[PDB]
Structures are given as C-alpha cells and as structure tokens.
Write a protein that binds this ligand. Structure first.
Ligand code: HEC
Ligand code: HEM
Ligand code: HEM
Ligand code: HEM
Ligand code: HEM
Ligand SMILES: C[C@@]1(c2ccc(Oc3ccccc3)nc2)OC(=O)N(Nc2ccccc2)C1=O
Ligand SMILES: C[C@@]1(c2ccc(Oc3ccccc3)nc2)OC(=O)N(Nc2ccccc2)C1=O
Lengths: 179, 24, 256, 428, 256, 428, 179, 24
C-alpha cells in the first residue's frame, strides 16, 4: 500500500504521459500546414471599375467583394442610423475593434466609394448575390435568406454579424492590397 | 489524503517523465 | 554501376547532437544561388523555408527579396510574374541537370564492408559527403588511359560512378580501372568564385562543404526537429521502461 | 437465453476443426437462433441494411481505385469513372443511390423500433449501438457527398463546417482543425476522403456489436411478449429457427427491394440527386438554392426552424447572457433532435412494450411519422411564410413527442392486454 | 431563383425503351460544331467517344479527321499541335460560357408541383427540354415593361430563370413579373443556319432539338448501356424473387 | 479448456450491462486466460505485432489525409507531408519504419513457432491463419512501398507485375488486369492505393481469428507440455492469469522494443530504406542496382537462385515440354517457399513437440536460421560468381528442411524426455 | 422430395447466376479502360540522329529505343549465325511470325542502319542500358545481368526472348510511326 | 440419374435466368 500502490500508479502516470505525447501529433497534424499558413497578402488592380460594378476575387479560398458604390448606394448607406442596425459593430480589421458601424467605418476611402469586404455570409458562409438585391438595396444570401445593405451590414435574416472587412488598403491610385 | 500514495504516485510518475523530457 | 570512395567530412549536423551551422547554410545558399542555380533547381523546396527555424533563418524581408529574383508562371492565370516566398525554387534550367532538392538523400556515400550495411550503420548514409566528393573530385588532368579518348562533352570526376568510361580504361573482363568516371557536368567550383559576406575562406573545399551542408538542409529541413522528437520519445520510453521493469519485478516476486 | 439444440459435428473434418477452432459452432448458433413465428414484414429491414452496407463498401472500394481526391482532379476523375472505366457508370450510380437505399432502410428500421417498443428493456444497448451506427452513417454519407467536388458538395461542406464554427468559444478552432485552413480546400477534401474510407469499417464493427446485442436478449415481435424460456418444447412452440424460415423470408424481401432499387438505378439514377452537383465547384459563387439530400432534410429543417424571433430562442439568449445565439441555438436543436431520439428507452415510461396494445400511443406515433415526412418536405423549402411556421410546428412536435408526450402517456394511458403467448398470436 | 416553364419535347431517348437516334445525334454534332463550339467547350467529352457504340457512331477515320480541326497544347512538350481523337474537346473559348459536357444533367426543366418532386417522377429531370427551351426562348420583341430599360449586353429569354431583370418589370413584392430573364448570350440559332447534308430541315426548332439530343448524349454517353444493364438486373431479380417467393411459401406451409 | 474462474458482475452498472450484453464477460475471459508461467522472452512478439498493426493503421490513416494517389502529385504530396504538415516528417518515418518493425517481429514470431513446435497439433489452424496474415502483410507492404512513386516504387511494381505475368497462358491477362494497362501507370498506382487502404483491416480481422484460435487451443510453452486440465488447482500450479503478469511482462518488452525503434526513427530513418526512392519515378530508365526491402530479400534470392542452367530447372523444362521455363520456375520456387512454410504442420512427423528435447532438430533449425539470414544477405548481391552458388545452396537447404529433413527426423530421431509438468520446469 | 428439391435447387441456381452477374463487373472494372485502350500510334522525328546514338521515347508507358547502328554494330550483328542465338524467332511484329532472328529481320531497313525496338527486358521488364554495354556489344539489363546483342537478340542471362520490335515504318525520310 | 432434380433443377433455374435476361 505505502509502496505497493506508489509504483503501480507511477507506472500508470508515465504511460498516460507517453500516450498523450503520442496522441497529440495525431490531432495536431490536421491543423493548417506550413503552406496554408504562409498565404500572404495579394494585390488587386482596380483600374477598370465603374460605379455599380462589383469585382469578386479569390483570397484565402473565399471570395472578396470589391464594389465601387454609386451615388444612390452611398446615399442610402449614409442615411441609415446606428439604431436601425441589427449589429452596431463595424467588424473592420483596419479601424479599431470598438469602432461603430457607420457608413464611413465600412469603406476604405473617406468618400465611401470603395467597399471591400469578405463576400462570406456570417451565418454559415455562403456568397450573397450582389448587384442591388434584397430588400435593402444591397446583398441577398439565398442559402437561408439574409439581407445586407449598401454598406454590407446585416439588416434582416439569420446572419448574426455584418460582413467582415479585411485588412485592406490602397497602395496606389489603381491598386489595393488585400491582407 | 486517503489516496495520498495513489494520487501522489500518478502525479510524480507523470512529472518525472515530462521533467526529464525537457532536458534536451 | 557501383559505389566507390568518398571523403569523410566532419559536418556539424552529423551525430545525435549535431545541428546545422546557420552561417554555413547561409554561405551554401549563396554558393547555390550564384553557381549551382545556373543549371540546377530545387522544385520541392519552398522559398519561405529560408526563414523557417532550424535552417538558414533569414529575415523574412531578405527572403522576400531573394524570392523576387525568380520569374514564375502563375499557377492559375498563366502570365509570368515575380516570385513570392510561397513559391518553390524553379525547375532545373538545364534538361539533364537533376533536381537538387533531395540530392543529399538520393545518393549513398558509403558501401560495404561486404554488402553488410555496417559502414552506413556507423558512418551514415553519406549523401553530403558524396556531394562534397563530386564537387571537389575533378582532377587537373584526366587519367593517363584517356588522353585523346575523352567523350566529347564530358569530364572526369573521381567520385562519379554512373558515367560512361573510355574503352582504354577497362581491363580484360569489363571492369573499369579508374577510380571515377566521366560526368556531363563541367567543374563548377573554382577558387574564390564567390565573395562571402564575412570574408570567410572561399576555396573549393570551403564552397563544397558549405553547399553540401545547404543541400542536406534542403533535402531534410526538419532534421533538428526529427532529432528533438527522437530524444524526447527516447527519454519517455526510457522512464516508462524503467517503471515497467520495477513493476514486473515486484509483481512476479510472489509467484516465483 | 432461449433453449435450443447445440452444434454437433458429424463428419471427420468438422470433428477435426471443432476441437481446434469452434467457428462452425458459432456460425450454427448464429443462424439457428430461435425467432418468433409472428414477425411481420417490417422485420426485413435489418437484412436490407446489412446488404446496403456490403454493397456500399464494395462499390466504394472499386470506385476508389479510379477516383483522385484532388481538387484539380476529383470532378475529372468522377467523369472518367462515368465515361471511360468499363462498368464505371453503373458502379458510381450504384454507390450514389446506395446511400438513399441505406437511409430509407434505416429510417424504416428505426420507426419499426419506435412503434413496437424494440428500444425498451432489455433492449437499450441495442438501441444505443444503433444510434452510434446512425451517427457514423450520417458522417460517412456527408463526407462521401463531398468527394465529387461539385457545387452541392462544396457548399454542403461549407455549411456543415460552419455549423461547427458556430460553437461559442472553441468553435472557430474546431472549424479550422476540421478544415485545415481558412475555408474548405484541398486539405478538407483529402481528409474527408481518408475518413470516408475509414468510417464504413467502423460501421461494420458497430453492426457486429448490434448483431451480438440483439442475439443476447433475443428478437422482439409485434405481440411484444417475450419467448417462453421455461422449457425447450414451449420455446419451440413460440419460435422457429432463423434458418431457413426467416433467412428465406428476408432474402425474398431483399430481392424485391433490390428489384425496385435496380429499376430506379437503371432508369432514373439521378432522380434523388441534384443537378447542381454536375457543376464544378466554384468557391466564388453559390447556387441560387442549395438543398441537402433527402435523408438530411428533416434535421436540416429542424436547424432552420428556430430563428431569432422564436420565443424559446430569445429565452435561451437571455439566460445565456448572449452566449447562445440564434445560430448556435439552431445547431443545438439539430443535434438535440437526434439526442432525444437516442435516449427514448428512458423517456418512454409505459410498462407495455409493443405499441399495438396502446390505444392512444398509436395516434401520436403516426403523427410523428407524418411529422418526419413533413420535416423532410419542408427542409427543401425556403424559410418564408408559411414554411417557417409549419417548420417550427413540426420541430416542436418532434421534440414534444419524446420530451413531453411519452412520459405522460406512461402514466395516464390505459393499454389493452396483450396475448398470453406468441403461440396465441400466431394461431389467429 | 426559381423553376421556370419548359416545353416538353418527345425525344427519342425517353422512357425505358429509349434509344439515341444516330442521325439526330450526327446533326446535333454538326450544329454544335458550326454554332455552339465558337463560344462553348466540352472538357469532359473525349473526341474518340464519337466513334463509340450507342452514340453518333461516326467512322474512325471521320472522327480522326474531325479531331484535326482543334489546336491543342501538348502535355508532353507544351507546344501547339493538331488535335487527336484521344484529346477532349477544347475548353470554352469565351470565359462567361459554361461547359456543355454535363449541361443536360446540370439543369432540371421540370419542377413542382409544390416541391414534392412528383413532376420529375413522371417527366424526368428535363435537362434536354430546358436546353431546347433556352435555345428557342428568344422572342422578337422584349417585354413591354423592359422596353427602354434593357440591360446592355443582355437579351431576354423566356426560359432563362437566373439572370437580372429591369426594375420596371419587377413588382411591389420584389418578384419578376416576366416569365423569362435576361441572359448574356445572343440568339444562337436561326433558320437555315446549318446546311444538313441529308436534307433534314434546319429550322430553329429542329436545330434546337438536335443540339439538345447531342448534349444529352455528351452528358450521359452510356445511357443505352445503362438501360440495358437495368433491364438485365431487373429480370434477374424478377426470376430470383419469384423463385424465392415459391420457396418461402413451400417452407412456411409446413409450420402454418 | 483450462479450468478457471468466470466473470461475476460486482457493481450495479455491471449487473445491468451483463444481462443485456456480456461484453465485459468476454473481455474478462480474454485477459484472464490462464497462460503457462514458464514462458520465456520469445513469447513477447505477439503484443509487439499487435502494436505494430495498430501503429501502421493509425499512421497510415493520418498520412492518407495528405497523400494524393496521382502520378503527377504522389511524390510531391509525400514531400509536402515531409515538409509542410505538422510533424509529417515524423509520421512518414514512423509509417516507413513500422513496416520494418512489423516484419522483423513476424520473422521472430515465426521462428519461435518453428523452434518450439507451436505449429504442431492441436495448433494447425493458428499456423494457417498466421500464414494468411503473412501473405496479406506482404501484399500490403508491397503496395505501400509502391505508393510513394519513387524509382524503387516504380521498378519494384514493374518486377512484381512481371512475375505475375510470367504464368503460362493466363499470365499476360493477369498482368494486364493487375496493371490496368500496358505497363505500370496511374491506374496501377490508384488501385494499389485503394487496396493498401483496404488490406490492413482484413489483416485485423485475420488477427482477431488468430487470437480466437490460440485462445481456443491454449498457449504453448517452451517445455511443450500442455497445462493440466484435470482440476482447477493443478491448472493453477502450471499457469498464471494473463493479467497482470504477462500483460505487464509483454508491455515492458514492447516498451524496450519501442525505445530502440524510436531511437532508430529519430536518428537514422533512412538506414533501412534505399536512396533511389528519393528520385522521381522514371519509366524510361532503371536504377543500376535495384534492391528490394530487406524483408523481401530472402524470397527474392530464392527467386533469383534457379537459373536456366540448374539441373532441376532443366528437368522441369523437359517434363513440361517447355511450358515451365526458368522464369516461371523461379516464380514457382518463390511461392513454394511460402507453401512449405505453411505445410510444415503436416511435414514434421515427430511426436515430441518442443525442439528443446530434439538433439538433431536443434542443429537443423539453427542451420535454417543462419540460412534465412544468408538468403537475406545474398538477395541484395548480384548474381555473378560466387553469389549464384551461395543462393542456390541456400534455397536448396530451405526447401530440404521442410521437404526432406523434417519427415526423416520424425522417424530416425531419438528425443529426450520432457518434464512431467510445467510446474517441474518452472521450479528449476 | 422431387418437386421440393427441384424448387430449392432452382432457386439456388438463379441466385448463383445473379451473384455471378454482380461479381463479374467488380473484376472487370480493373481491366484497361477505354481511355487506355484508345492510345494510338505516335510519330518520332529522327532527322537529328547520328550513327551510334540511341533515342529513347515513351510509348504505351514503356521506353522504345531507336538506334542508328554504326558500321561496327552492323558488322558485329551480322556475323552471328542462328546457332548461338538463345531463341531463333526475330519476334518482329512487322514480318512473318515464323521468321528467324537474322539482323535483316531485326531492322526496319535493308542495310540494318536503323533499329527500332522495345527497351523492355523480356525477363521481368527492366530497361537494358545502352552504349555498347554487355559482353556482346549491345545492351545490358542490370536488374539480373542479362546481355543483348548489337541487334537486340538475347545472348546471356535469364531473359527467355529477344527484345521485341513493335510495328514501325518510315512514312517520311526522317519520321518513324510507332504503333 | 441419382440427382436428377438436384442437378437438373440447378441448371434449369440458371438457364431460365440467363435465357430470359437476354430477351432485351
Ligand atoms: C551546368 C553548367 C551545371 C552547373 C553550374 C552545376 N551542375 Fe551539377 N550537374 C550538371 C549536369 C549536366 C549533371 C548530370 C551529370 C550526369 O552525368 O548525369 C549534374 C549533376 C549533379 C549531381 C549529381 C551527380 C550524380 O552522381 O548523380 C550533383 C550532386 C551536382 N550536379 C551538384 C552540383 C552543385 C552542388 C553545383 C553548384 C556548386 C552544380 N552541380 C552546378 C550540370 C551543372
Ligand atoms: C447499418 C445499420 C443497421 C443494421 C445493419 C441493423 C441490423 C439489425 C438486425 C439484423 C436486427 C435483427 C432484427 C431485424 O433484422 O429487424 C436489428 C434489430 C434492431 N435494430 Fe438494427 N440495424 C442497424 C441500425 C439500427 C439503428 C440506427 C437503430 C436505432 C436507432 C437500430 C435499432 C434496432 C433495434 C431496436 C432492434 C431490435 C433488436 C431486438 O428486437 O432484439 N438498428 N438491427
Ligand atoms: C456506409 C458506407 C458508405 C456510404 C453510406 C457512402 C456514401 C457515399 C455517397 C452518398 C457518395 C456521394 C456519391 C455522389 O454524390 O455521386 C459517396 C461517394 C464516394 N464514396 Fe462512398 N460511401 C460509403 C462507403 C465508401 C467506401 C468504403 C469507399 C472506399 C473504399 C467509398 C468511396 C467513395 C468514393 C471514391 C466516392 C466518390 C465517387 C462517387 O461520387 O461515386 N465509399 N459515398
Ligand atoms: C500481425 C501478425 C500477428 C500477430 C499480431 C500475432 C499475435 C499473436 C499472439 C498475441 C499470440 C499469443 C502468444 C504470443 O504472443 O506469442 C500468437 C501466437 C502464435 N502465433 Fe501469432 N501473430 C501474428 C502472426 C503470426 C504468423 C504470421 C504466424 C505463423 C506463420 C503466427 C503463428 C503463431 C503461433 C503458432 C502461435 C502460438 C499459439 C499457441 O501456442 O497457442 N502468428 N500470435
Ligand atoms: C499492415 C499495415 C500497413 C503496412 C505494413 C504498410 C506499409 C507501408 C510501407 C512500407 C509504405 C512505404 C513508405 C515509404 O516508402 O515511404 C507505406 C506507405 C503508405 N501507406 Fe501504408 N502500410 C500499412 C497500412 C496503411 C494504411 C491502413 C494506410 C491508410 C489508411 C496506409 C497509407 C499509406 C500511405 C498514404 C503511404 C504513402 C505515404 C508514405 O510514403 O508514407 N498504410 N505503407
Ligand atoms: C449528404 C450531405 C449530408 C448528410 C448528412 C449530414 O449530416 C451531418 C450533420 C452534422 C454534422 C455532420 C454531418 N450532413 C451532410 O452532405 C452534404 O454535403 N449535403 N448537402 C448539404 C447542402 C446544404 C446544407 C447541408 C448539407 C448533404 O445533404
Ligand atoms: C516492399 C516491396 C515488396 C515486398 C513484398 C513483396 O512481396 C510480394 C511478392 C510476390 C507477389 C506479391 C507481393 N513485394 C514487394 O515493394 C516493392 O516494390 N519492393 N521493391 C522490389 C524491387 C525489386 C523487386 C521486387 C521488389 C519491395 O521490396
């Protein structure tokens, strides 16, 4: 007992440690590999984009939306008040995490002309149909029926949050750097 | 306390393995 | 073909506690870029691995600049562009120049004693020492048997073995008499062909040693991880073995 | 523990082998188990399920000899199977419709168990093993459906992985681990292929455990009255040996089922599929209407039913301080449907086993059957009016059947007396 | 989106005893080559499949001559060369034009009545009918609501149900009033656009029916083989089931 | 049939589960089998083999999540595993050296069986099941080694397929069926990958049958004297329960073996490989010195031994009217080696079981062991002089051991008396 | 039981027929597919091939050697009579199957300058090494040390047959149609 | 002749399946 149990349970503990050390790699091998984690930024040439046309680009496996908003889209966008919104967080990686979901915090330029966002519905990850669709003149998700506005904010449907905005910036007059 | 040796042995055996494995 | 002689080099990575000399790998990288890359490539080595720990460990900005020198045909689009660190090194520019990614693991450096594999058991596979022996194994003049019988476009190398051999060098029953054979690679290393950062010695033996080390890391980047994992698993199984021994001993104490 | 005769070697080789490995004795005891004489045609679905498992394994093994689990080659490899490898079109259609046959058989199996109380004591272990088998089947079919790498494959994988991503706190990590990257990509396809190969053998092992579990307790019958264990004569008076009496019966039933299945495969193989899966997967665009397979539509509907506006969802959000949101509540409801199906042996508190002698349990059981069909139908519909309301009511009744109705019926019901013996039932 | 209305066509390959009309498939191949192939491609369809049984069944030499009209980049050397029967049809020359290999299986012409799927049970999937309706679904004049507001570079199609719609033709609820939608493809067919050698009429209806039949064959080139195998299996299982029924009856007569 | 105690449910949950599924009783009977108390360290290789099978399955399932069975991607996918995936280098080396560990373990297992007469009656079924397992292991290792798609993989596949095609008449058809084309190509790689995934589960089933067979017959011991079945007390004086005694002994032995194995894997993974397999497969050029893996070298040597000029080969050619040529004779000899290894239980006609009490059998068995090592060594050597004579003599002795020596020793040998009981041997 | 046995064994026979009908496709799908069987002839340019240099091409997934035999190779190959050849058959698919393994019957032209051949050892499929290797001025298979004459005929080793010659012909002055 | 029905029945059952299966 005093020594009979100590040895057996010490052996069991060492065996458990070895078993865990062997088991952990079997699970960790399924995490993203070195090649996946190395995927860096990309550069998009927006030289040919009139107002109203959306430009969909593959990045990290998913679509990124880059839409140049028109006169009316930006009017509607800036007209909506923070209280009318289902989600008041801007969900923007560029500005600070506490920033409010005003139209000026959803775009890259102060004019609110270029809207760059993950085209990935925050419900379960479908691609909303753009080109002025839905009930708010924005994007409509057909998987379960989510409505987004001209700023990419959730207004109606299962989606909890607004469409996220990546770390994005204009590197020159005609070139954006995603990620 | 009733299982002082059973509990102490398991932890001590585990520590002796992890503690030594980090000596490289 | 066969397996002949090689010069045993005390590489730092040899041994249970052997580890890459980061500076040596940086020198080898330079020699590869400036000399070997002209013909050879490493289609399997990702460029980003020049900053992965346990290797040359360059700053990612330097790696990014090194990667920019390569032109690459985008996997999707099709139009050429500058190389990113996510891309692999290019294919061998020269058709018949083999890829050097796995060369340090694709060659045996020792053979014997009598097909018992004991020499490899005590000396290792010998890939880097065979590379070193091929780079440094170009003599000044060919063997006497070949003067005026050299295959056009080939050069004699002491350590190469899978090459053709002039009929003048074989004996009566088909066996070649020369130590080496005729390789299609011109002597690529010449004294001070490279100018190093720290002014380190840049003789042929130095460049060959450095590039061998670099090619060893290129073939197996996770060697230092492999040996850390090994030592760990060994220490664990050692503790468990001791405990299981004492357990079996106290358990059988009663029956017998 | 039904009394019966035991194996007895007669020939030389049998005597030689029995003393060394009693495998023939085990086989004899397995195929000679006494079974009730009064089993009706609803007991034939176990053999159908066994055949479906074997067919799926064989067809998948032959298919994997030609399929390439690579995003740049998976769709091309499947079309190569369809067009180039001799017989490949028939093999692929067999493997595709075998899932539908497997799941229709499994649902019939499950609902027979629900009606006749085959989940009740002493048959709880069999039910639990079956539930594990069903979860394994669901996972296997899910990961198989992604291998073609069409539009439906891609976006079904996306949605199913988002379900895991919806878990609070550890959800994003679990989703990344299960995807091996930011989104479904080559790593996801490759790991799914590996696990799709793996899982059917686990299902086979679980099915062997199923067989042993139901061999231990015996076989349930429509009467609900156990076989008489008092003596061998009475046991034989209530039962017949499984071979040949029920072997041939179940084989004939399987032959008819296979007649229908082969007619479907030969003359409308892709009626149960979706045309969109014949489009190469496009990560940059989603189909205008994604629809799961029919055997996942009920629980997909249960997932869709509970939106933010539902009162129970709001209560869950309030009690959890916002941790349980509408999305995670829907995921929890989808899994909790299968959960409440799982532990029905402890919710049904009625002493009488067979549902044939429970006058008012029949009404609720057939309402549940209609409800399962309605959930199947409404899963494919949009969540607009009136589909949302009927979906909510269907899910609510599904949960109330197990959680509310069955415990109450266990107390207030007045069942009728079953027959004294299986002999009395079989002789009338 | 939603399900549109497609004009049901009595194709020769409908029902259990359905067989591709060889001449119709040849006409469909002709009209595909001279009209559709300019913008479209069938990457999954080998050219050699034109000679296989249960299809167009063209002579081997004719198929080999037909394959020469394509310029294909060789996999061996990465150089352009004349096509060969072993090569698939070219990809879509125009980007915004999908592959027509599986179009006849990638579209469902029949939907409803209320999502129960009964319509497809008695009418089939209807992919060929959808293609026929799309090809012939271009009216001379667009809807009156859209006039003056037509999208640029798009054409109205009575059968298409996935394109944009002008704001004028939409309703208060937000659904399109027009049965059709605006597709990005001009009317491809036109009376006497292709000269059939056998003298069969070249109206838009006949041509569209021929293209639909050919595209059905391309999608499922082993449909007749599938039906024959289905009949064979059904008959085997029918005989087996009758014999098993008799056996079961005889066996259970003893205990009953 | 060794008398011993039976499982008794103690706690409430155990009593509940026993009446429904006696899985715990089966596990108890399995781990509590009375085994002889005089077993030496050569009995530890069964647990080693069980661990090797489990390790191979687990590591292979892990690897298949990242490996692409396509000629344009297989080598690249393996390099991706080595370089990019977390710990993939360790997993690949573990799966590569686990084959070597598995085969050294089975060779030790087999030679223990040969020495101690564990193949003899009543243990023929165990030996036959083991031989089936060994054939399955050989096929699995062959296909696995083909999967990397290096030079050695390609040319080993070429050689093995050629050996299959050497069969008269039907050889070409069988070779084309196995290859799926004129030569080794993508179809061969893909089907080999599928069957490499399939086979280990068949091996696991065969191992379960192996376990059941040796449980039925009872374990063998060095003395060769069976346990006393007369009474429980006498059986206990000859045996101890498998748990905890032999469980712990075998686990300790496995721990030491794993210490050595992990040292090898972590400090020289490529010693047991071939450098040429790190070269992408080149159908247009062969390595100058292709060599099989060490665990196939002895039978490769037996294949190479019989050339056209050997007298027995010429006799076979003459008797068969040229149907059996040197190539097919070599193939037949390579398979007949396994055939005699399987047929040993009926060739050894000696009544005494253990080789410990057979003075001549000791000499001949150790000659056989030296001969197996010599065959392993000479398989890797060229066929020139003197290696041809060495290989011929080694193969001749291998065949003469089973076909000639053992039947004769069964008649002319004069064994010595074994101990009266296992108790007598243990107490000494 | 006359009728009893008749019915039972008829059921067994129908079941066996159905089982065989189901089993045969499982075996048959492993045979070469329509894609593999459709592989046709190729064309090889020999405009830049000098005497003594071998050209290795890929056909049916195997190497084919096209060698311009030098004067020495032609002289050596024609010297050996049929007596010392291991097998008499030329094994050339372009002439009568019964023809002897003469140098004239091992080449595509009457002067024996050209030699088109399968570069696959007839023993177990390895690739013989060229360059006037072996003990007969021809090829040498190192897998099992087999020797092939200058004309490709087997002279020593375990190979039972000469290296086969496929269908070939000079459609042009400097082109060969393999297959 | 000892097994007319056992033998003839097996062949007759097989022929009926094959003979009819070729009707289409
Ligand atoms: C062209 C000018 C070359 C440059 C510069 C370098 N190499 Fe090379 N290499 C070249 C050829 C044509 C060949 C094939 C030779 C043959 O006979 O097949 C090679 C081969 C190698 C090898 C493999 C040798 C072997 O036995 O397989 C090695 C290890 C090698 N080369 C190394 C190497 C290094 C380190 C170089 C930079 C210092 C280098 N080569 C440059 C052509 C050329
Ligand atoms: C591939 C999956 C399955 C197979 C092959 C299978 C097979 C069988 C078989 C052969 C039987 C014997 C009686 C019969 O055939 O009806 C049986 C009984 C039963 N099965 Fe399953 N089954 C499967 C899945 C399930 C599932 C998913 C459940 C429940 C969720 C389930 C619950 C039961 C029950 C309750 C019984 C009654 C046992 C008894 O009466 O003793 N089974 N099954
Ligand atoms: C319970 C067992 C199994 C089930 C329920 C199952 C189910 C499925 C389903 C539903 C599909 C989708 C088919 C399609 O959409 O076209 C599929 C595809 C596939 N399955 Fe399985 N499968 C099972 C076992 C296996 C096994 C054991 C293997 C391999 C040995 C396998 C290999 C494949 C392959 C390669 C595909 C893709 C090819 C294709 O689409 O037909 N499956 N499976
Ligand atoms: C994966 C392969 C194998 C595994 C896991 C395995 C496992 C075992 C185990 C656990 C035992 C019990 C006693 C012991 O451990 O020594 C055993 C016994 C035995 N094995 Fe194996 N074995 C394998 C392959 C083989 C093969 C290939 C052969 C013969 C060709 C063989 C022949 C025997 C014999 C003769 C016994 C003695 C049984 C007795 O004395 O009752 N085994 N094996
Ligand atoms: C008795 C069981 C097994 C044995 C003896 C075995 C043996 C082998 C061997 C010798 C190799 C060659 C490794 C190399 O040359 O690098 C290999 C490769 C491979 N095996 Fe297995 N294997 C087994 C089971 C499995 C299983 C169950 C799977 C998958 C489910 C698998 C998947 C693979 C893969 C993907 C490779 C190629 C990757 C690599 O080279 O490591 N193996 N196997
Ligand atoms: C067959 C199928 C499936 C089956 C069963 C299934 O259960 C699971 C539920 C939870 C976890 C794991 C499995 N999960 C998918 O796989 C697949 O991708 N879809 N399509 C699809 C399309 C849109 C949304 C959802 C699914 C299916 O219907
Ligand atoms: C591991 C190995 C192997 C093992 C075992 C093995 O047995 C079999 C024997 C007969 C039939 C089927 C399987 N056949 C190959 O796989 C492989 O390709 N080589 N290399 C190699 C190289 C040259 C000749 C032969 C083989 C191996 O040694």
């Amino acid at each position: 007992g005093t020594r009979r149990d100590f040895l057996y349970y010490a052996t069991a503990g060492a065996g458990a440690v070895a078993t865990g050390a062997a088991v952990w790699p079997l699970i960790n091998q399924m995490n993203p590999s070195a090649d996946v984690q190395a995927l860096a930024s990309i550069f998009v040439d927006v030289s040919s984009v009139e107002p109203g046309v959306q430009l969909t680009v593959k990045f990290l496996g998913k679509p990124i939306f880059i839409r140049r908003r028109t006169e009316a889209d930006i009017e509607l966008g800036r007209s909506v008040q923070l209280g009318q919104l289902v989600d008041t967080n801007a969900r923007n990686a560029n500005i600070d995490a506490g920033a409010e979901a005003t139209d000026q915090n959803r775009t890259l330029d102060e004019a609110g002309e270029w809207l760059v966002m993950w085209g990935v519905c925050t419900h379960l990850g479908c691609v909303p149909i753009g080109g002025v669709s839905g009930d708010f003149g924005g994007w409509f998700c057909p998987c379960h029926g989510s409505h987004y506005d001209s700023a990419g904010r959730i207004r109606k449907g299962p989606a909890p949050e607004n469409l996220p905005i990546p770390l994005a910036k204009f590197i020159d007059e005609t070139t954006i750097q995603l990620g | 306390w009733k299982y002082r040796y059973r509990l102490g042995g398991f932890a001590s055996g585990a520590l002796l393995a992890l503690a030594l494995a980090g000596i490289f | 073909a066969g397996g002949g002689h090689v010069e045993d080099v005390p590489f730092s990575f040899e041994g249970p506690f052997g580890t890459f000399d980061q500076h040596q790998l940086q020198r080898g990288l330079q020699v590869y870029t400036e000399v070997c890359a002209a013909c050879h490539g490493m289609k399997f080595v990702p460029i980003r691995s020049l900053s992965e720990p346990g290797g040359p460990e360059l700053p990612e900005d330097q790696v990014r600049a090194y990667a920019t020198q390569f032109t690459v045909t985008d996997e999707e689009t099709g139009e050429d562009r500058e190389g990113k660190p996510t891309d692999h090194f290019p294919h061998s520019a020269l058709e018949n120049a083999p890829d050097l990614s796995l060369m340090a693991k694709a060659r045996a450096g020792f053979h014997g004693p009598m097909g018992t594999g004991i020499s490899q058991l005590f000396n290792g596979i010998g890939g880097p020492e065979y590379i070193y022996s091929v780079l440094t194994g170009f003599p000044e003049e060919p063997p006497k048997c070949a003067e005026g019988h050299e295959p056009d476009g080939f050069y004699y190398n002491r350590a190469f073995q899978n090459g053709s051999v002039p009929d003048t060098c074989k004996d009566a029953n088909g066996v070649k008499t020369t130590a080496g054979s005729w390789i299609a690679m011109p002597p690529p290393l010449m004294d001070d062909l490279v100018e190093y950062a720290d002014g380190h010695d840049a003789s042929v033996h130095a460049m060959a040693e450095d590039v061998s080390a670099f090619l060893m890391w290129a073939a197996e980047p996770k060697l230092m991880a492999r040996k850390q994992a090994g030592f760990t698993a060994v220490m664990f199984l050692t503790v468990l073995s001791v405990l299981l021994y004492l357990t079996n001993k106290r358990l059988w104490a009663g029956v017998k | 523990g039904i009394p019966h005769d035991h194996y007895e070697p007669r020939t030389g080789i049998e005597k030689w082998l029995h003393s060394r490995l009693p495998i023939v004795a085990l086989a004899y005891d397995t195929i000679m188990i006494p079974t009730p004489r009064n089993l009706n045609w609803m007991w034939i679905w176990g053999v159908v399920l066994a055949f479906c498992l074997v067919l799926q394994i064989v067809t998948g093994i032959v298919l994997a000899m030609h399929y390439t689990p690579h995003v740049d080659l998976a769709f091309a490899s499947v079309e190569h199977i369809m067009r180039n490898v001799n017989g490949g079109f028939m093999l692929r259609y067999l493997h595709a419709n075998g899932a539908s046959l497997f799941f229709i058989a499994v649902y019939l199996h499950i609902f027979r168990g629900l009606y006749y109380g085959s989940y009740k004591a002493p048959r709880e272990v069999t039910w639990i093993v079956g539930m594990l088998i069903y979860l394994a089947m669901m996972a296997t079919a899910f990961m198989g459906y992604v291998l073609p790498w069409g539009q439906m494959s891609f976006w079904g994988a996306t949605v199913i992985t988002g379900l895991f991503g919806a878990i609070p706190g550890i959800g994003h990590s679990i989703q990344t681990w299960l995807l091996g990257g930011p989104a479904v990509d080559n790593a996801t396809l490759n790991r799914f292929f590996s696990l799709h190969y793996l899982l059917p053998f686990v299902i086979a092992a679980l099915v062997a455990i199923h067989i042993w579990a139901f061999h231990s307790t015996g076989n349930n019958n429509p009467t609900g009255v156990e076989v008489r264990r008092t003596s061998k004569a009475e046991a034989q008076k209530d039962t017949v040996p499984f071979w040949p009496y029920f072997i041939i019966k179940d084989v004939f039933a399987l032959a008819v089922v296979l007649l229908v299945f082969f007619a479907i495969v030969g003359f409308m193989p892709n009626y149960l599929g979706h045309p969109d899966n014949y489009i190469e997967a496009n990560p940059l665009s989603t189909p205008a209407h994604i629809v799961p397979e029919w055997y996942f539509l009920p629980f997909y509907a249960i997932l869709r039913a509970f939106t933010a506006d539902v009162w129970v969802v709001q209560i869950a959000n309030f009690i959890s301080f916002g941790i349980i949101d509408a999305k995670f509540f829907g995921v929890l409801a989808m899994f909790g449907a299968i959960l409440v199906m799982a532990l029905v042996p402890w919710l049904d508190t009625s002493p009488v086993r067979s549902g044939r002698y429970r006058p008012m349990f029949k009404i609720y059981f057939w309402l549940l059957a209609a409800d399962f069909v309605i959930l199947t139908w409404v899963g494919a519909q949009q969540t607009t009016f009136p589909y949302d309301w009927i979906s909510l009511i269907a899910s609510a009744y599904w949960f109330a059947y197990f959680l509310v109705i069955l415990p109450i019926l266990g107390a207030i019901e007045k069942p009728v007396a079953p027959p004294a013996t299986i002999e009395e039932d079989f002789n009338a």
